[PDB]
Design a protein around this ligand. Structure first.
Ligand SMILES: O=C(O)c1ccc(-c2nn(C(=O)c3c(Cl)cccc3C(F)(F)F)c3ccc(OC(F)(F)F)cc23)c(OCc2ccccc2)c1
Lengths: 260, 261
């Protein structure tokens, strides 16, 4: 158990690191998506030829090229999430194998969480907000690739209705990483002591920052259910691609995360 | 939202109804499993045959692994009626759109069956027939083909879930929370369902702070288990498909197949 002033310090600690670790915040993403700004306007990709123009503007075959782009951005995201994780008080003091295990199982759940920040019902920001690729264009891609992004959009539309801001997400992201129920953890108890602290901070953070939003804490935790299901569908989709596209390689970092 | 004394009333209402609806409570099951009228123990093939002949289990009436697997289905269908009766006592439930009531039960019973199955389990086996029998985990795990591996994940879930040390008054409210999930496919009117679940969540949170004041963030930890429940339900569906498509001895009377659809 923690005193109320220590939880506020912990929330601020975490928000500060989240800003330092992730260059495209939700606040910046919403300013680009909402608009009314002439300096932050994205170039919009909705079909093949605007995709061609995007290369010229924002800097094989289309569906593959886009999918390879998503892999590259995922590797960067794992790198950003890994950096954030080291700042969670207690994480680096854990057994190394557990540090690796918590990241292996947490990074995708956090990626889809933060990907929601860059999404509205009509598409997703790309290339640090300089581009915007429509949900419709992604849904039209051939083979198995058309269905790769749609479950993420479905989650994001629901998840974004909670109206979390970055200061909320910073703590929620930390709660996800310090899950004591990950397969293969050696010392569950130190992980759960940390997550109790993180959960207490999130509970206090949500009550102060959304006092009119009843039971947001519970509703947000129930969303970890939706994250797990997206990870599993996605792994199953990668398996199909690996067994049908033999030209296509995965980054070792991604390859290692999905083994077992 | 709701005043604290109303949550205590809601918690007690749900506890009373949970008692009347389910024959074998967790308190009673825990008395039997710990050793506190000893149940008949099924640990191998011959003790199973004697259990049928002596105590006469209604779900044990083809071949052993199949007969056991179908028995689990019989009891699951009985449990669905018990859960359905309980849901009708959750304040607000029967005032929901009839299709939505049907949708919420349809998608909720699997998660509630596994939740309450844990009450009848420890690391060594499972109570059956309202506590009169006890089937060992080793015996279930030892079954052939996919049947051996069908049974083990429930024990793995149950051991972790039981570590939270919930009692029936906690579980009465948690069960109600599961049923009022606003994210089931095909719901027509989500708002009243989520309004009821907000009430239930407040009642559950207060129940857990009062009943387990030393167990910090138990409320949070219990909700995190809804991840494990959904994952095991989806695993479970995938295993039935594999059995249905591979096991030819698994056909019953057409009327029974209809009951168990
Ligand atoms: O009394 C009660 O509340 C109760 C409630 C559930 C079960 C029970 N359901 N079930 C399933 O498969 C299942 C599930 Cl979870 C959810 C939805 C649908 C099904 C279905 F597919 F079956 F339809 C089991 C599997 C294995 C099992 O044994 C175990 F867990 F592996 F050790 C017990 C179960 C139960 O079984 C008692 C029993 C055990 C052994 C022989 C005969 C009866 C009791």
């Amino acid at each position: 158990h923690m005193e109320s002033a220590d939880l506020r310090a912990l929330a601020k600690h975490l928000y500060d690191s989240y800003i330092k670790s992730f260059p495209l915040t939700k606040a910046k993403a919403r300013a680009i998506l909402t608009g009314k700004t002439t300096d932050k306007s994205p170039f919009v990709i909705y079909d093949m030829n605007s995709l061609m123009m995007g290369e010229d503007k924002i800097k094989k075959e289309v569906a593959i090229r886009i999918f390879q782009g998503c892999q590259f951005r995922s590797v960067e995201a794992v790198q950003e999430i890994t950096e954030y994780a080291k700042s969670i008080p207690g994480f680096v003091n854990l057994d190394l194998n557990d540090q690796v295990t918590l990241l292996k199982y947490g990074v995708h759940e956090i990626i889809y969480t933060m990907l929601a920040s860059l999404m509205n019902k009509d598409g997703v920001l790309i290339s640090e907000g300089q581009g915007f690729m429509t949900r419709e264009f992604l849904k039209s891609l051939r083979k198995p690739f058309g269905d790769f992004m749609e479950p993420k959009f479905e989650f994001a539309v629901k998840f974004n209705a909670l109206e979390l801001d970055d200061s909320d997400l910073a703590i929620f992201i930390a709660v996800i990483i310090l899950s004591g129920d990950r397969p293969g953890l050696l010392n569950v108890k130190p992980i759960e002591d940390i997550q109790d602290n993180l959960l207490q901070a999130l509970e206090l953070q949500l009550k102060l920052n959304h006092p009119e939003s009843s039971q947001l804490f519970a509703k947000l935790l129930q969303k970890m259910t939706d994250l797990r299901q997206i990870v599993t569908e996605h792994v199953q989709l990668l398996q199909v691609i690996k067994k049908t596209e033999t030209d296509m390689s995965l980054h070792p970092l991604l390859q290692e995360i999905y083994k077992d």
